[model samples]
Target: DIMGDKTVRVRADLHHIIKIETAKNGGNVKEVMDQALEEYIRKYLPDKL
Candidate 1:
């Protein structure tokens, strides 16, 4: 189903913060969120690593 890119759903507050940081860093939101989630998973899902 997710061939190119999977859609993400987020809480209003979390999205709000991400947007705030995006403006400060001038970063792509998709890349920002994707890498953030990947890092979080790597930290928490050590068994998979």
Candidate 2:
């Protein structure tokens, strides 16, 4: 189902790269960015949980 949360702003160039890479995998932008956010937190804050 569709969903949303707080809006996130990102640089145009970075977003373009993400958009292109995501299309290659036949995925929507949010899917890629969501995984990226998870990875970032896992790498930097493993003890947060």
Best-fitting candidate, scored by lDDT: 2
Give lDDT tens digits, candidate 1, residues 1-49: 5558888798889888878888896877788788988898999986786
* CA shift of 27, model 1, Å: 0.7
Off by over 4 Å in 2: 1-4
TM-score of each: 0.70, 0.73
The regions of model 1 sitting more than 4 angstroms off are: 1-3
Q: Give the TM-score of candidate 2.
A: 0.73
Please provide the root mean square deviation of candidate 1 (C-alpha atoms, Å).
Answer: 3.2
Give Cα distance to truth, residue 7, candidate 1, Å. Answer: 0.8
Error of 2 at 22 (Å): 3.0
Clashes per candidate (backbone, < 3 Å): 0, 0
Model-by-model lDDT, in order?
0.83, 0.84
